[PDB]
Amino acid sequence: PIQTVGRRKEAVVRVRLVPGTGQFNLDGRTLENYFPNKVHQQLIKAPLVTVDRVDQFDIYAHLDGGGPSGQAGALRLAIARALILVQPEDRPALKKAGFLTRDPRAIERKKYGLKKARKAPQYSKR
Amino acid sequence: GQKINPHGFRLGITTEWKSRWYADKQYKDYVKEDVAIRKLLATGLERAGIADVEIERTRDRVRVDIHTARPGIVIGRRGTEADRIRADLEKLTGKQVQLNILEVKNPESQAQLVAQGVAEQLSNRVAFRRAMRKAIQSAMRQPNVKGIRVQCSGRLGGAEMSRSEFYREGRVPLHTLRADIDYGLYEAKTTFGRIGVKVWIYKGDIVG
Amino acid sequence: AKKALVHKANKKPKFAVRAYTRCNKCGRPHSVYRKFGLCRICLREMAHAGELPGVQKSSW
Amino acid sequence: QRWLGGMLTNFSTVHKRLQRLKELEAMEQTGGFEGRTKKEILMLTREKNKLERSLGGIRDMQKVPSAVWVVDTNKEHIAVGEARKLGIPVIAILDTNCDPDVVDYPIPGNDDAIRSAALLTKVIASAVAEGLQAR
Amino acid sequence: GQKIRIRLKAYDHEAIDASARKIVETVTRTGASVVGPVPLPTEKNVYCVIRSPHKYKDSREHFEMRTHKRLIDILDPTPKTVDALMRIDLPASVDVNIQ
Amino acid sequence: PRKGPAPKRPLVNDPVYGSQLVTQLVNKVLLEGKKSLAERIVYGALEQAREKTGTDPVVTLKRALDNVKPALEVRSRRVGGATYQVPVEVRPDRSTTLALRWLVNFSRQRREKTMVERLANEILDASNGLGASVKRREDTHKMAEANRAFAHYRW
RNA sequence: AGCUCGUGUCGUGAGAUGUUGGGUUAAGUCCCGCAACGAGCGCAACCCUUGUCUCAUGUUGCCAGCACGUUAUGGUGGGGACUCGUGAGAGACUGCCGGGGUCAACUCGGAGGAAGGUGGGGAUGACGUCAAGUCAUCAUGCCCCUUAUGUCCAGGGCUUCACACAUGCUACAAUGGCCGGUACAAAGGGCUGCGAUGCCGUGAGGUGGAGCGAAUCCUUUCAAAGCCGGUCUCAGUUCGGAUCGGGGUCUGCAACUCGACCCCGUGAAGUCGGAGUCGCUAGUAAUCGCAGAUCAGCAACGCUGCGGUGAAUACGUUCCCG
Numbered sequence A: 001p002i003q004t005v006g007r008r009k010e011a012v013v014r015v016r017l018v019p020g021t022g023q024f025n026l027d028g029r030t031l032e033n034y035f036p037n038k039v040h041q042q043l044i045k046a047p048l049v050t051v052d053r054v055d056q057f058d059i060y061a062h063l064d065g066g067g068p069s070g071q072a073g074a075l076r077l078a079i080a081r082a083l084i085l086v087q088p089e090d091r092p093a094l095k096k097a098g099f100l101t102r103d104p105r106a107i108e109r110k111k112y113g114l115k116k117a118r119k120a121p122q123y124s125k126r
Numbered sequence B: 001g002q003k004i005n006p007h008g009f010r011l012g013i014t015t016e017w018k019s020r021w022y023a024d025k026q027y028k029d030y031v032k033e034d035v036a037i038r039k040l041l042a043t044g045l046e047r048a049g050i051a052d053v054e055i056e057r058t059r060d061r062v063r064v065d066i067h068t069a070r071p072g073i074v075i076g077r078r079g080t081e082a083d084r085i086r087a088d089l090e091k092l093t094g095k096q097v098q099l100n101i102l103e104v105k106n107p108e109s110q111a112q113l114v115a116q117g118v119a120e121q122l123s124n125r126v127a128f129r130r131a132m133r134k135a136i137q138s139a140m141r142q143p144n145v146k147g148i149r150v151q152c153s154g155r156l157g158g159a160e161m162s163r164s165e166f167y168r169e170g171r172v173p174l175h176t177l178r179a180d181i182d183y184g185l186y187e188a189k190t191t192f193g194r195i196g197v198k199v200w201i202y203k204g205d206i207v208g
Numbered sequence C: 001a002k003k004a005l006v007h008k009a010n011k012k013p014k015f016a017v018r019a020y021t022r023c024n025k026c027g028r029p030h031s032v033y034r035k036f037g038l039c040r041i042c043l044r045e046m047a048h049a050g051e052l053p054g055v056q057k058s059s060w
Numbered sequence D: 001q002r003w004l005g006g007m008l009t010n011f012s013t014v015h016k017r018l019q020r021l022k023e024l025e026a027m028e029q030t031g032g033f034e035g036r037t038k039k040e041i042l043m044l045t046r047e048k049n050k051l052e053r054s055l056g057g058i059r060d061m062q063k064v065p066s067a068v069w070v071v072d073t074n075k076e077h078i079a080v081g082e083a084r085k086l087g088i089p090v091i092a093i094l095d096t097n098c099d100p101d102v103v104d105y106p107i108p109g110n111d112d113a114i115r116s117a118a119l120l121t122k123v124i125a126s127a128v129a130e131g132l133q134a135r
Numbered sequence E: 001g002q003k004i005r006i007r008l009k010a011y012d013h014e015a016i017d018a019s020a021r022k023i024v025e026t027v028t029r030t031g032a033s034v035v036g037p038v039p040l041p042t043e044k045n046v047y048c049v050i051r052s053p054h055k056y057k058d059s060r061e062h063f064e065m066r067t068h069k070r071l072i073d074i075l076d077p078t079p080k081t082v083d084a085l086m087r088i089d090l091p092a093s094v095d096v097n098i099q
Numbered sequence F: 001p002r003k004g005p006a007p008k009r010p011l012v013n014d015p016v017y018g019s020q021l022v023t024q025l026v027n028k029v030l031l032e033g034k035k036s037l038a039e040r041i042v043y044g045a046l047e048q049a050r051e052k053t054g055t056d057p058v059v060t061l062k063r064a065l066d067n068v069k070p071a072l073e074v075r076s077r078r079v080g081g082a083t084y085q086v087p088v089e090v091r092p093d094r095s096t097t098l099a100l101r102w103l104v105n106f107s108r109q110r111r112e113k114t115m116v117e118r119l120a121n122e123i124l125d126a127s128n129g130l131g132a133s134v135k136r137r138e139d140t141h142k143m144a145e146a147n148r149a150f151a152h153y154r155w
Numbered sequence G: 001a002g003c004u005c006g007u008g009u010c011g012u013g014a015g016a017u018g019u020u021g022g023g024u025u026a027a028g029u030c031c032c033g034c035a036a037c038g039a040g041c042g043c044a045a046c047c048c049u050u051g052u053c054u055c056a057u058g059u060u061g062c063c064a065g066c067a068c069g070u071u072a073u074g075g076u077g078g079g080g081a082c083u084c085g086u087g088a089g090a091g092a093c094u095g096c097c098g099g100g101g102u103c104a105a106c107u108c109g110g111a112g113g114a115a116g117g118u119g120g121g122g123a124u125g126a127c128g129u130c131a132a133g134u135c136a137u138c139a140u141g142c143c144c145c146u147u148a149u150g151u152c153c154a155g156g157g158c159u160u161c162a163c164a165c166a167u168g169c170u171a172c173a174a175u176g177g178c179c180g181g182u183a184c185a186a187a188g189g190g191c192u193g194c195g196a197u198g199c200c201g202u203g204a205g206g207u208g209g210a211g212c213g214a215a216u217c218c219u220u221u222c223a224a225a226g227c228c229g230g231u232c233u234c235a236g237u238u239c240g241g242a243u244c245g246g247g248g249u250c251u252g253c254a255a256c257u258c259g260a261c262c263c264c265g266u267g268a269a270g271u272c273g274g275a276g277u278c279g280c281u282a283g284u285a286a287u288c289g290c291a292g293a294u295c296a297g298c299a300a301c302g303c304u305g306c307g308g309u310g311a312a313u314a315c316g317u318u319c320c321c322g
Helices: A037-051 A068-086 A087-095 B025-045 B080-091 B109-125 B126-139 C001-011 C038-045 D012-028 D038-050 D077-085 D114-133 E013-030 E081-085 F018-028 F035-053 F059-067 F094-107 F115-128 F132-146
Strands: A003-008 A012-018 A025-028 A058-066 B019-021 B050-058 B061-070 B100-103 B146-152 B163-170 B177-189 B193-205 C055-057 D068-071 D090-094 E004-010 E033-037 E045-051 E060-074 E096-098 F071-078 F082-089
Touching: A003 A068, A003 A087, A003 B025, A003 D038, A012 A068, A037 A068, A037 A087, A037 B177, A037 F035, A058 A068, A068 A087, B025 B050, B025 B080, B025 B177, B050 B109, B050 E096, B100 B163, B109 B126, B109 B177, B126 B146, B126 B163, B177 D114, B177 F132, C038 E060, D012 D038, D068 D077, D077 D090, E013 E033, E013 E060, E013 E081, F018 F035, F018 F094, F035 F059, F035 F115, F059 F094, F071 F132, F082 F132, F094 F115, F115 F132
Parallel strands: A025 A058, B019 B050, B061 B100, D068 D090
Antiparallel strands: A003 A012, A012 A058, B050 B061, B146 B163, B146 B193, B177 B193, C055 E060, E004 E060, E004 E096, E033 E060, E045 E060, F071 F082
16 A cells, blocks of 8 residues: 655645556546646646656545645645655656755744734834 | 743743643633632731742632741741631632641742842831842852842932832843743832832753 | 722623623723633733733744 | 963963863763754864864963973063063073063074074974983 | 543643543553543634733734643443542642543 | 845746746736736737737747847936936846836737737737837837936946 | 953053954854953843654544445444644754865855755843833822712713824726636634524524534535636726615614614716825735634724735945934
8 A cells, every 4th residue: 555645835635546547536536627727737747747657647635725736736746755655766856856845835924013924004204 | 111021931931830720611700719819818918928829729629828938927826817817718708728838948049038128128218229239148148049130110219210220140041941030029118109129030040 | 990980890780781891800991801801901910920820921 | 373362371261271171072082972952062063173273282281381482572472471470481582673681591593484493493392301301 | 331531631731641641550450441542632722912001002912821632531331440530639730521 | 135146036947838938927917916817818818929920939929029128228326416317238137027027017008908919919019010119128228328428437 | 232240461540451453144153363361141042833754642533445324424333554633752953075265264056855054933122212101900109179079870972074194995997897607725713602404584584493511513514816608898887886765684771863784776986196105025015715802783994813826126335214
């Protein structure tokens, strides 16, 4: 058994792999039925295309937290780490494109006495 | 308002809570009774130095511990004013009270006791000079402590003007959380109003 | 608060809506949290005094 | 490396620094390097390096000084002044810019040349070696 | 035949852990089966207060209250465990109830 | 920015065309924080250009921006309460930035009542050289060359 | 980012030196040289949170793999293979290399790595200054009423209006307006409280009640922006919502002055706003919804938080301010 976990700014995904055909399951939907974005499509294709072994794995994803782009990035990173695990020889490839660099960017706290984060109220000289 | 309370700053690492119990539905009644008993205990005894008062309130079990420098006027041989305390706590419906009275081994090493003593010394006739210098010297005689600062504010000396004076010896690192810093505030009454005395005592460091 | 106002607050109102907060320690009718029953000033002062079971400085 | 100002006349602080060096070298030999903060050990070693390249002979003085040999007194005004104030005899080289009235045991010569300085150092160390041999 | 959960709550981590350890030791001494003190979400109440009376609203201070809760599940209801349950001494800041 | 220049931001390669000009344009036209709608607007404009000119979008946009890329700018420097206009040459990066900013800012003025055809029409006009971006470019060069005298401050 | 002390040295002396100069740094942070050598309070660190992993760890949480479920779903048994809930620990330390360096701090580039140079943000605000604010949080000395300025009570005011200032929200629309479908967040709160199904309403809502003192139940499997399909085609607009009319719902003993919300109708100003001015340098502004405190109901567009989507330039100190 293989199971991998991905996280992206409050979105958490868990991916299971099968060596089956070139199709994906996202909580019961395919890659086009769910995440109907061409940009997200290329984003998720980027690991497999970089490793140049597309259409060789069937993934099953369980998703929580975040929105479209956050979960898309989380799935991308999770499947990238899963592929690195099953085939370590591709480790010096994704790092060349920086797909192993997890993104440590989140929502900055809204600070009291202000409007939001770094925004400030209007200042009047009189 | 620049320096925050060091005691309240250190409630998460160094200093613990002086009133520990648990409640979910009856928080209002508990806190009302707690402030009532605290005020009654503070008012009933004033000639002695009450350094600390801790309250315990669990289920049917309620008890309180009072720390004083001179327990002789606090626990009688027969318990007369102790019985007065018992009557007062029973009037306000404090149920069973296991009121144990404790003492302090180094009364000169407590911020509250030093503050109180320098307060009456400044109030009666003595200038802030001699009283607070003597308090600092008495604290620095004891070797366990390492630093002290004493501040006084108000109409010092009876003058008609605000005044504030601070004297410091040793190290008083407020900005260190793991610093065993004891803080005490007191007010000395007078015909000119009130004089505030604030004592910081830094006594070594503690590491778990 | 005037002692008469405090006693009238202690006196239970003759109508349901005629009741208000009347902070316990002092008697400041504004900004009285239902969790404590205290005014915000008194709550802050007592919490910084280390005499409340659970309260502490917030930071995150 | 450099003559510290007033380290001779002030003997308490040099003793404190010598104790600090002794204890720090003892801990370094013992091997305490990862039982503290990593950054703490980093500037600990930095303090080691800073207080070692100017501390080469003071580490092994112990029994106070009695004679001071001075090269380029015009660059060593403070050292000679401290020795004079403390009563320590001063044996110094005289240059044309130096005051002969200051040195108790003046030795004319050139202090701007390595060869003359090397020769003078060698002869004076031969003198002190003979003194120890005949001691 | 019957299993009992006990909810076990406190602000303080030290006292709650000590109570759990004592109860587990007592159960082991008595001879009954328990799953163990499984962790539960920690409730947090957050409040805001104004530092200064009479104006200067921008300066405030936040307060928290944290309650750590756990469950202890006991199987095989040994009668001696029930006999020795309520006599166990517990810390002041720790509250345990049965379910 | 007082101490030194901040490091330049990287540009993510455009997945559909491979050149970053299109993603720069879509990032600039982006407003209210929506990448998808701006992307579809730019892509619709580019495909209208495809069907109207019959040539490759990359090269036509390239020489269009080259023909609308400014070369010099005018800067204000004040002394004694009175200002002076000095001409300074521009790095190509800010030149392309200003050209694209002009295009996007003035693409809200064409009176055909839809943004995607607005972009397609102005892109085609700049490709033909009759667009208003050419007019702003000529005005900027007129300002730069006419006031070439006041440059002795050397900035 | 500054404020002091011990010893030493200088001056008859108050005093000075250290704390000056060059460089560097977020910094009195550090280096070099200098009669200074060192040490305290400040700074940094010990604290909270976010980003990775290891171990302990399975309920109310999850469901890989197995049986019962067939649509109502981990729902019912079971399980740690995965998040997760919560405890402990590892790890960012100029660690290594190369060029500039005074073989110095330091600066840039590279390697590994989740992060490269205080990773991101909170908490903490020194000595001092404004006779700054608060006798209306509380107490506090002096003066005042003391048969009253005390004091209970009914109605009315703090929302009055020809004006001016400040802070906000909604619009001047086609990057849009209206109609149906479609899928993913977080946090929080709940006892005379959250309150689901059915019953009848256009919608607030009237009937009554199952789950929960609460990882169990309710906030719809929790929203909007997003995407798809239909239409509107530039007008005071299928924009905009003000004022005004008729009829109601909820709470409250009591809704006119003076609560909120609902149905229907005419549909005012409003065309990107002069002199001038404001917030902002990475998950920031901008946009969108949700939650909480106070609250019976709310004037809330306010305040404190959460999450979604998310780019621009920074040449350089010449000028304006601290």
